[PDB]
Design a protein around this ligand. Sequence first.
Ligand SMILES: Nc1ncnc2c1ncn2[C@@H]1O[C@H](COP(=O)(O)OP(=O)(O)O)[C@@H](O)[C@H]1O
Ligand SMILES: Nc1ncnc2c1ncn2[C@@H]1O[C@H](COP(=O)(O)OP(=O)(O)O)[C@@H](O)[C@H]1O
Ligand SMILES: Nc1ncnc2c1ncn2[C@@H]1O[C@H](COP(=O)(O)OP(=O)(O)O)[C@@H](O)[C@H]1O
Ligand SMILES: Nc1ncnc2c1ncn2[C@@H]1O[C@H](COP(=O)(O)OP(=O)(O)O)[C@@H](O)[C@H]1O
Ligand SMILES: [Zn+2]
Ligand SMILES: [Zn+2]
Ligand SMILES: [Zn+2]
Ligand SMILES: [Zn+2]
Lengths: 806, 835
Amino acid sequence: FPDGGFVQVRGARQHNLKDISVKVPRDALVVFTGVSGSGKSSLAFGTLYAEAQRRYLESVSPYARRLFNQVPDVDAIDGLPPAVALQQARGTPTARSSVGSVTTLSNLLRMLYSRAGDYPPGQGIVYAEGFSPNTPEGACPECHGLGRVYTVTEDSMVPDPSLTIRERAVAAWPQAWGGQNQRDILVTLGIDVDVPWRELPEETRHWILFTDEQPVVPVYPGLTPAETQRALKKKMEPSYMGTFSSARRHVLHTFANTESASMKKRVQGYMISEECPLCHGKRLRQEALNVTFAGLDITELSRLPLARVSELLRPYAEEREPGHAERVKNRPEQAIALQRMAADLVKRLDVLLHLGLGYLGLDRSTPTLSPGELQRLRLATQLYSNLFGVVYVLDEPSAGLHPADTEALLSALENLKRGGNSLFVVEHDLDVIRRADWLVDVGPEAGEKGGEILYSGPPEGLKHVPESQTGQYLFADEPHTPREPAGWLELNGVTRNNLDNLDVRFPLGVMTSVTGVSGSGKSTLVSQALVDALAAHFGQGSARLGGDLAQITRLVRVDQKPIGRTPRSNMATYTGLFDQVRKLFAATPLAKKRGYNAGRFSFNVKGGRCEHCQGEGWVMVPSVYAPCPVCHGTRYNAETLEVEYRGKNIADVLALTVDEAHDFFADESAIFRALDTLREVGLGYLRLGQPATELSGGEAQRIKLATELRRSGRGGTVYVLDEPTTGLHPADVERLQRQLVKLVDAGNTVIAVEHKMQVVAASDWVLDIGPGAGEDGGRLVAQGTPAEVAQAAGSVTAPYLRAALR
Amino acid sequence: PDFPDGGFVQVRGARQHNLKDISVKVPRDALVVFTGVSGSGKSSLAFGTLYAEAQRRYLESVSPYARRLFNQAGVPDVDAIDGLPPAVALQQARGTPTARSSVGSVTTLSNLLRMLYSRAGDYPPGQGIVYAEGFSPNTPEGACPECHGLGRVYTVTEDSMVPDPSLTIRERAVAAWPQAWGGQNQRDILVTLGIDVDVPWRELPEETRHWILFTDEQPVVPVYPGLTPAETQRALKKKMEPSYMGTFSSARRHVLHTFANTESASMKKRVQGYMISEECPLCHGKRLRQEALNVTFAGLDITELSRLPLARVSELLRPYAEEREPGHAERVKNRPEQAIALQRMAADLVKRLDVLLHLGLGYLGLDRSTPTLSPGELQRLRLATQLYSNLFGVVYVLDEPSAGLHPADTEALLSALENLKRGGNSLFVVEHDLDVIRRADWLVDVGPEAGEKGGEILYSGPPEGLKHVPESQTGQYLFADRHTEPHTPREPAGWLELNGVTRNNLDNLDVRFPLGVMTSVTGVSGSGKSTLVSQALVDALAAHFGQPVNPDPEDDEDPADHTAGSARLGGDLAQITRLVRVDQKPIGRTPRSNMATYTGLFDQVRKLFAATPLAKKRGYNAGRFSFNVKGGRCEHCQGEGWVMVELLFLPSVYAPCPVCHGTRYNAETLEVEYRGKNIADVLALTVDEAHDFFADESAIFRALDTLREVGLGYLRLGQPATELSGGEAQRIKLATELRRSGRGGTVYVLDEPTTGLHPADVERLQRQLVKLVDAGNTVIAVEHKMQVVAASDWVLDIGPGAGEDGGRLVAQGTPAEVAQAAGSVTAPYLRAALR
Ligand SMILES: Nc1ncnc2c1ncn2[C@@H]1O[C@H](COP(=O)(O)OP(=O)(O)O)[C@@H](O)[C@H]1O
Ligand SMILES: Nc1ncnc2c1ncn2[C@@H]1O[C@H](COP(=O)(O)OP(=O)(O)O)[C@@H](O)[C@H]1O
Ligand SMILES: Nc1ncnc2c1ncn2[C@@H]1O[C@H](COP(=O)(O)OP(=O)(O)O)[C@@H](O)[C@H]1O
Ligand SMILES: Nc1ncnc2c1ncn2[C@@H]1O[C@H](COP(=O)(O)OP(=O)(O)O)[C@@H](O)[C@H]1O
Ligand SMILES: [Zn+2]
Ligand SMILES: [Zn+2]
Ligand SMILES: [Zn+2]
Ligand SMILES: [Zn+2]
């Protein structure tokens, strides 16, 4: 590290950051550490990314991104090169988009299916972006590339095919006159109403149901068919003149033109999700599906794992593909480019693969990727992206990563950097922290008591800081006797993805860690197959339950996913905490004296809230959340704020930290109660009205948990939860474990997917999955007490577990 | 004598435009400069390839879904670049419009001082805080409410709307109304509601001819198009289905709407002719809320401050920043919170402003429209801004930052360049200026000549090295010894006065240009030259002739950004018959406009294809070969051959038409060949190929010749106006004057004519002007380049300095003479260049 090889930050203040300074070197693995909530993000993304983002955008687009003056709070940053963020900003959704498109590979075999690729006799050429499901030319024009449709069929419009038409055999039709009209139209149109439906010929039932036709026929109502037929022949004067409307035509048109509650509803009852009948779920025009390569259309290829895709092309790159012989001389132009295309396709593929992302299929949909999977995908994609001289900002690239592969990751970082780039990574993985060139560690604790720089330097240096929470877990190096299973629950013959008719069993009233290499199949076992089975069986693919079911009654399930989308929702809203605070306000002399309803203090309904914001407090103006205008951040009008409980109005308490709220609501029973369950979950740092789209999702998780951690009034529910270590510093996982240890004792089962061994080591039972990932996975390598799995042969995880028990 | 290892940017396999599939190492951390004659490919490498790829990479990495798809353009054609940091370009791209900004805007400073006026600056007793965003005409808290922040109110009036009231409505007497369908559409709606659409406008009763022309009303009437009022009424009686249902909208409404609701340039305009526009009675034209206007700084309201020169601005604001303000003590004690904010705030603007000022920029006013700056200016402003703008680790890419900079002030350009780099960055700089070049760190010199005859890398290495590269033209000029090739100044054949010129700097200046004789107008940057030559003299001569010069397909100025300041002529005007200015403004602002068509030579091409076997066999005339009318032309693009991408968020660019493929023509027509050649194939031809191909064809060869001798050998007959540099556009203009001059006595005004001209191109440009001075004609030209000032027959030396220390006629006479002048700044540079 040469002097003036550094980035110089002075007076950073953003959020809890306590007006601090840091030098951190460019061209190095700088790892940003410290307790959750402490300040790492507000340093790494709040200041460095944010600032560097901005000085650049204003130079590139003096157009109007500069014009957009409404900055991070920071006096100075010297030596800051342009930045690239590999995890999108907190308050954003994820765009709807595929693995292959994130990684660009999708576009690149699109080019390939075009130049190369086997055109059938006599039909032209299909341009690159006509093999895409998201371009007008490429997508099949029915489903629009989605591959699904949402419509009508025989079985939905006739749930009981044995009725006569007169009997309303055609459930999807109108009720009073509407059904009458048509029913009558049919008899006039020489069709017998009075046989059961199933009795009727093909393209008749199909006509009756589907036809976009609408003949206009004389209708003689309440006459018998025999006579209706005769009086037609006499050309006798009708009673009116009817328009026929195919069952489908009603149903759809209705869905398209009503503002009616049970109307739409009852019509959606003749509507089921089923695969597009044009393209058969393969997402593209027949003209694009017509083209084939290694005997596949591109959809087919796209749904293979990257790992196989890397194999399928591999010959072509090396010119050793059976057929190549009778292809070089008889077609030059392409065979040179085809090689190159494949050659280059493999080259990239391979970097992905070396990150063991080999199991993802390129059509896989990024909303359904995890934080890690995705970040590591981005990390791979950048490794060939070709940027030089930038700082990549990373957010726990090790999320999900299993301790054996941490070396492949530690590698891709070394390679990015080795491309003349700089690396800012916030991390908690002691294995990642261990190998970084340079550490920087944040807060002592979180929030108000955080946001100071405890130490910026090489990581060994932390040795000399007694009071760096991460100083300990990193440096200063009671075991666990598994508890007796109170009974067993079986999830049998789960066939899905990876998994194939796998039978499996989890012990009740006790901890289960389901370990295994990343992609080995934890989540489709435990967060997919298991969770569904259990919620189908209770109130709320094609498995069966079995075993001691009567012994469990509920299923709380703890996403990483956010507590809500809009600033509408927020931490108070979500827990039930706000209803008790609105209740309290409506109870005051002042509210009682005025007309005021309970929840005139809702910023979510008309009345108490100011009209500009119609509630929110944050008016949206990358796409970023700059606060309100002319309520002035509050969310409420002048009166509703006039109501004060012990000197604090509604907005006054919403802008209140749980710690302060706990002080405050001291003799207010089920509030001071509810607050403890966040204070214990460790959230004492947060505003009650801090919107959902600002919390770390690690945070979000802590809340959903905060909920159940006192509802357990009768403990016999199952708690299944994906990555509980989500975004927790070591010190944090300890306080986590604590809270689970508790909620197991009140007789509760907790199946937890888990890559960190620390917490597995403490489990009561373990299940190792796969042996490796993808197709090399989906099998049960080992189960039993940690000590028992820790000595198992087959498993990849056993030595790290053994490591973590000694 | 040493640039560091692997700290070179490595290019490989760059076959961009003409670029002959090349490779160059270019050190980072250095003032690198790119050289070569106009056409050689330096913009093709430095922008076009190196820059262009730094973005393709950097944005794709920063919105890896968004940008990506939008490489509906971006295939820089190169195999590899390594060591390429991310880039910032300072010229915006070729055929990109300047979107309308101001100095204060680009420099950031405007925003910087709403912020001073809000949080300090004098407030009247009543008034609470006006926030910063309330001192801008673009906010609701800013804009004066009566005129909506514009400056002025617009009402609409029968006389404007309908100028000739004798015409039948059906024959279009109501010019306000929209063209085409939308026209006849409101008409057919009238005939439906029983309105006499065929008896002179002035003949209807006031009420009904008022209502239409003025109402805020919308009757949803049935309309049957194609049918006379008589057979239209008996169609409404018998209640049969209408073709369409048609909403009506008063002529008012349409005209108002259209003004407030088009992104469109040439449509917001088309309605201005039907709008009377007073200054805003409440605004007094300043664009803002009376509340803002109440707040003062050192006497002036923000608008007042905003018209001042950057030099004045800092001049009046420095006292505040050093705390040497008059009555500081009395301000800090009774006001300690704001006085600290006031100095800190002041001193940051002064700081920004000296950068602005050290590069000779103080002559400019914060409120000057950017579309009226010269590129030399807003690039030097853009450089300017950058220095305090704080970026680190980047490649700046500059296109001739010294355009229009007088010799005296290069040292200035030259340490903004130095300073910027020393902020941790890379500059690359396309450059014809020998004194910049001589001080570069690395040089890339390009293809021995232009187009096909260039796009090579003759050399790349430090400066002294070009010494040894025999085919480098820039080499020749950078190292040629003092060429004692002295010019013998031509005798004026007359004299022309421009007396009492008052505008910008110039206050009653009296000056005389000799005639039939090349005169250069030299002067430091900012001093007066343009306002005197391209402004003052031209309107003075234009108004003296019938023709107000400027074609009608071309406009000029968003009503007000230049001066009325007039002045009066006399001398020998009896000897002048024509005015002809030549500027770097495009032959066209869209691909519609190519070279062939700007000359007129295309007509005779079209006619040629009309006498083939095909053109007889199917009914083909010149017109199925025009690309500006339907028929033989392709219609997906409309003959333009090109489509835009306003979806690309940053400055929208142009992509080949997807249907016809940059060709412009329906296939059926591309089958017609002339002497072995398509119609697209000829549009594709170079100037040197076309010469060959049409040797006999006299009407073409002729116009082609003037193009070749004017330098443009390498441009293509159909090469979209928008790929053209301006320095090439300028040269085009000139070719079509040479051509129609076998006469005498016109006066050519040339606003900087060595725009983006290598010393070898200029040398051939002179030759070319000398041809029309020998013809009797006069040429006047503002000039920054002592080379070409040497050749002249008369120098006028302007200002002393720029702006307020300028506007004077400090010296004059022959070059030989003027190089001896008293207080001329150009004085010693001529003596230098004369020897
Ligand atoms: N997006 C955000 N908006 C507002 N406040 C935030 C945001 N992110 C974090 N904070 C606040 O900043 C402090 C620390 O946040 P953060 O830097 O995310 O900690 P960590 O680095 O441990 O994740 C907390 O008080 C937290 O609520
Ligand atoms: N939502 C999904 N859609 C399709 N395939 C999936 C999905 N989730 C996982 N997979 C596939 O299932 C296999 C196992 O992945 P998963 O259960 O997510 O493992 P882990 O939980 O161990 O990361 C992989 O082959 C992956 O491609
Ligand atoms: N922006 C552009 N778009 C299309 N063609 C261009 C563009 N710029 C240059 N060309 C063509 O590229 C060739 C090289 O010229 P150019 O790149 O302008 O380099 P220079 O201006 O330094 O000589 C010329 O034939 C020119 O007409
Ligand atoms: N269009 C304009 N609007 C307002 N001020 C202008 C305009 N053009 C020039 N000026 C001012 O007029 C003075 C004369 O400058 P000019 O003659 O254009 O510079 P130069 O002598 O370098 O050509 C300068 O101080 C400049 O600030
Ligand atoms: Zn489909
Ligand atoms: Zn509001
Ligand atoms: Zn006004
Ligand atoms: Zn076209």
